[PDB]
Amino acid sequence: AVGKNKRLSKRVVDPFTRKEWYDIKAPSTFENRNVGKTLVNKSVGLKNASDSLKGRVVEVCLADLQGSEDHSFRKVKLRVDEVQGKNLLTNFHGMDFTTDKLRSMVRKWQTLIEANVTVKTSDDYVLRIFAIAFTRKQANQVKRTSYAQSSHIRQIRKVISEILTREVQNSTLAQLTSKLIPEVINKEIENATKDIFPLQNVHIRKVKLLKQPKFDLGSLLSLHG
Amino acid sequence: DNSQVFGVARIFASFNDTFVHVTDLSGRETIARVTGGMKVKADRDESSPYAAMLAAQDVAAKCKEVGITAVHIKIRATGGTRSKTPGPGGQAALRALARSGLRIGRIEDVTPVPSDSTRKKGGRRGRRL
Amino acid sequence: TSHCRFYENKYPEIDDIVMVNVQQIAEMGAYVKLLEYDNIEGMILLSELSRRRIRSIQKLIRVGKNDVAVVLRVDKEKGYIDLSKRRVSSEDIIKCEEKYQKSKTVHSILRYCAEKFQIPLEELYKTIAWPLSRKFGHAYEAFKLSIIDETVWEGIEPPSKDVLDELKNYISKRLTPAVKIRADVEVSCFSYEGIDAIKDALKSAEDMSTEQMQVKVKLVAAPLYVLTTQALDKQKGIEQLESAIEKITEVITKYGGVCNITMPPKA
Amino acid sequence: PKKRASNGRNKKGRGHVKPVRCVNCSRSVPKDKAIKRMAIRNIVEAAAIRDLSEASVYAEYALPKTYNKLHYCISCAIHARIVRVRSRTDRRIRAPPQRPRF
Amino acid sequence: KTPVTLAKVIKVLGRTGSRGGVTQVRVEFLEDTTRTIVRNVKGPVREGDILVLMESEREARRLR
RNA sequence: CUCUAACUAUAAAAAUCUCUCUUCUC
RNA sequence: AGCGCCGUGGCGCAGUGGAAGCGCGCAGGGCUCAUAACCCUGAUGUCCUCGGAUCGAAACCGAGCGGCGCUACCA
Ligand SMILES: [Mg+2]
Ligand SMILES: [Mg+2]
Ligand SMILES: [Mg+2]
Ligand SMILES: [Mg+2]
Ligand SMILES: [Mg+2]
Ligand SMILES: [Mg+2]
Ligand SMILES: [Mg+2]
Ligand SMILES: [Zn+2]
């Protein structure tokens, strides 16, 4: 189609010859330390390529970093911070679900439970954690809904807040992520809330990094290699 | 992993002029931007499945020659306030990528969802065609 | 013999503009000849024919006459062209028709030269026309410069210098215009001697009239004096008329009056 | 006359409800008189499932489903045949069309 | 180029089109009979007949 | 005396209308 | 008076350079139960007048006519 008239308000080259492949290395928390590849323009001084990479973020499926298929719904945002040349170092930047799992997960005739929390980890990491849970029809049920009274929501949500904030304000990000990969926090949540209401399908979604202190080179070194 | 050089499809599929635009796995470097309107003329077949097929084949050729072998696919409807439904060309483009050599992994929907805010275009009674 | 392309190749290029003549409309549309490129056929089927709803079939096609056109696809094996007419914006159509007018005009002169010397028109286009279109963007502008400057032909390899001579003759006879540069001078004097000042002013002004460029300051009104000259290069009249302005200001800044410029020199 | 003792809305004693916008023509309608449909379907059509399964790594991919609850104004709903005009005695039956494929 | 393929029709999935002239055909590619497509045929046809195609992956929707 | 799975792809435009009303009883 | 234009098929526009153009008109038939809208098809012109260049002028231009917008009534 020629459509556009040419509202102007052939210098042809091979643009991808000026580009190169760099490997991806993930923190030791995940089993699969190598993630994939990334295309970067060649190192031209004064706008070096190394500056070009630093700050790149990426979405990677958690199965690809664990190899298992019980993690078929989670994804991790990784942020590159270090450059080695022909190999790069990425830091954990956040966690999230897949949209499909979450939309399938919310259902008619059951009240969902959401909890926000802003926390400070052991070192400096200003984080925010989102918790999603759902009520449960007990295995005797003939009253064929599973609604919860508002007071029970306030109680359960306060429990969610205390558990998340207590767990997270103890450890650095790495220990937190290693706790997260098998969701010990999930199990403890359903354990501490089952007294109030059955509260099925508890999970932790969309864990976000909000602030990091300066550079922390040594820890990132320790997490890769 | 036998060195499948992953890429990402990031299909955008509206009621009008579906988009296929491969970037790096980081989602920063463009590969084969070629769109739905590139390979169709009458501008009405912009959303037609055949448009998606043709753009998909062009992307497949360029992608295979640059080096990306496996492609991660994300389908995006118009999203935002607008209509929430995947474009008719999305299925055709996805099928066409699936056939043409490039391997597929981790397809998910990326269509944004608001919290029903920023009142939708149309007025009260809306489009009264 | 009337034939041959107007542009470089024989085949039209993708996503370009042409202007075609219609001769015949069978069922699916009109496959028609092109007047911007060569003489091969190219089809417009009914879907890409009328921007408005398809009501008048013969009224909007008018078999036998010319119309703007846009090429979509080219089959570079046999000579088949896919083409449309809806898809040319209102802004576009005018440049489309201007390019056609230019291409048509450049055609007839070389047609005359080829007929006279019995040389194929293809040869004349290959030798003189195409390098001119490369040098100057278009050949008609090249001929306009040829009227002004003889150097534009320097670098071309004629099939014979007799072609050059008769082409000079026919271009000078056919393409001849020398745009008129006009201006308006405001005499705002409240002074004592102004008539003699104006007499001396036009004496000085018309003393600069060259053999090829003659400046006359005609009277149309007392304050407004209209300056008329014919510039052949369109680049000397401005300076000569600014010289006239300098003359008039120098004359009247000492007689006591005031004079000002209303309209400077312009084509 | 009184055609709809329920007045269609299914409101019955709440004063007023927030209005949603038609996903076809953006006709603002109260959320209750706002006939709704679940868009529970596989992300890919059944005509290409194998074309993905064999031509993709990770054998036995989950094949995710897309989820949506679209809102239809009654005008677009009756025009696009999701809702159907029903006989006067048939207007009683609130039961769905009994599992379209049984 | 002529990448035509022969596909044997195994089922006539009813008829469609504006005037009712074109027919649904479930074709099965003669090369690699494992694959099946639905397409749209002008003119009468029965099961077991074969068709010649230029486009192969185009699974056109119902004409309307 | 016994059980919750299938999901599609529709909107070009179309204004107006002169008489004439005639009935039920074994 | 000079300038900026114009000179029509019934009216309006148009290219000016290859030589009767389109809409609006009107006549006729077509759709319509029928009218209007809409389809299609016609019979009419010194593209103002004299010239000069041109293979060719209605067209490029001049030497003149008529109608105009200004400049301005320009002892
Ligand atoms: Mg309407
Ligand atoms: Mg309507
Ligand atoms: Mg009523
Ligand atoms: Mg009534
Ligand atoms: Mg209702
Ligand atoms: Mg009350
Ligand atoms: Mg009336
Ligand atoms: Zn609607």
Write out which nucleotides of chain G lie closer than 7 A to a protein Cβ. Answer: 2-4, 17-18, 22-23, 38-41, 53-56, 71-72, 74
Residue A164 has which token pair?
A: 């998340």
- State residue C184 phi and psi, 5-degree precision: -135, 125
E46 touches E57 (CB < 8 A): no
Q: Determine the Cα–Cα distance for residues C216 and C230; give it in Å rounded to an integer.
A: 10
Q: Which helix (H) or strand (E) holds C225?
A: strand C224-231
B126 touches D21 (CB < 8 A): yes
Tally of domains in chain B: 1
Report yes or no on chains E and A touching (3+ CB pairs under 8 A): no
Provide DSSP, C113-156. HHHHHT--HHHHIIIIIHHHHHHHSSHHHHHHHHHH-GGGGBTB
Give B 66-95 residues with CB within 8 A of chain E. 95
* Domains assigned to chain C: 16-91 (2.40.50.140), 92-172 (1.10.150.190), 179-261 (3.30.70.1130)
Range of the domain at B37: 3-129
Tally of domains in chain E: 1
Q: Determine the Cα–Cα distance for residues D83 and D73; give it in Å rounded to an integer.
A: 10
Residue D1 has which token pair?
A: 């006359």
Nearest nucleotide, CA E64 to C1': F10
- State residue B111 phi and psi, 5-degree precision: -60, 125
E25 touches E38 (CB < 8 A): yes
Q: Was D11 annotated as part of a binding site?
A: no
B43: left (phi > 0), else alpha (psi -120 to 50), else beta? left
Half-sphere exposure of B111 (CA within 13 A, CB side): 24
Question: C61-93: b or e for each residue (b if 16 or more CB lie within 10 Å)?
Answer: beeeebbbbbbbebeeeeeebbbbbebbeeebb
Closest CA of chain B from C87, distance in Å: 9
- State residue C265 phi and psi, 5-degree precision: -65, 145
CB-based contact (8 Å) between B57 and chain E? no
CATH number for the domain including B37? 3.30.420.80
Q: Closest partner residue to A1 among B5, B29, B37, by Cβ?
A: B37
C203 touches C215 (CB < 8 A): no
The spacing between the Cα labelled CA in C116 and the C1' in F13, in angstroms, equals 59
A12 touches C80 (CB < 8 A): no
Q: Determine the Cα–Cα distance for residues C226 and B62; give it in Å rounded to an integer.
A: 66
Tell if the CB–CB gap between A38 and B24 is shorter than 8 Å. yes
Range of the domain at E13: 2-64
Report the residue of A19, A34, A59 to disrupt the B interface, i.e. the one with the largest count of B CBs within 10 Å. Answer: A59
Residues A166, A170, A173, CA angle at the centre, nearest 5°? 115
Provide DSSP, A44-65. -SSS-HHHHHTT-EEEEEHHHH
CB-based contact (8 Å) between B54 and chain C? no
Residue A59 burial by CB count (10 A; 0-12/13-18/19+): exposed, middle or buried?
A: buried
Residue D17 CA to ligand 6 centre (angstroms): 14
Q: Determine the Cα–Cα distance for residues A153 and A166; give it in Å rounded to an integer.
A: 20
Q: Which helix (H) or strand (E) holds C31?
A: strand C29-34
* Domains assigned to chain D: 1-97 (3.30.1740.20)
For chain D, how big is the Rg over CA atoms in Å?
Answer: 19
Per DSSP, the three-state class of D79 is helix
Per DSSP, the three-state class of D10 is coil
Say which residues have a Cβ less than 8 Å from residue C251's Cβ, sequence separation at least 6: C197, C200, C201, C204
Nearest ligand, measured from the Cα of D73: 8
Q: Determine the Cα–Cα distance for residues A179 and A185; give it in Å rounded to an integer.
A: 7
Residue D88 CA to ligand 5 centre (angstroms): 15
Q: Determine the Cα–Cα distance for residues E24 and C205; give it in Å rounded to an integer.
A: 89
C204 touches C245 (CB < 8 A): no
Closest CA of chain B from E59, distance in Å: 9
How many angstroms is the resolution? 4.0
**Residue C76 beta carbon within 7 A of nucleic strand G:** no
Residue D14 burial by CB count (10 A; 0-12/13-18/19+): exposed, middle or buried?
A: exposed
Residue C233 has which token pair?
A: 């290069």
Residue C49 burial by CB count (10 A; 0-12/13-18/19+): exposed, middle or buried?
A: middle
Q: Determine the Cα–Cα distance for residues C225 and C184; give it in Å rounded to an integer.
A: 6
Q: Determine the Cα–Cα distance for residues C70 and C32; give it in Å rounded to an integer.
A: 12
Q: Residue A37 pairs with which residues in a beta bridge? A: A23
Per DSSP, the three-state class of E50 is strand
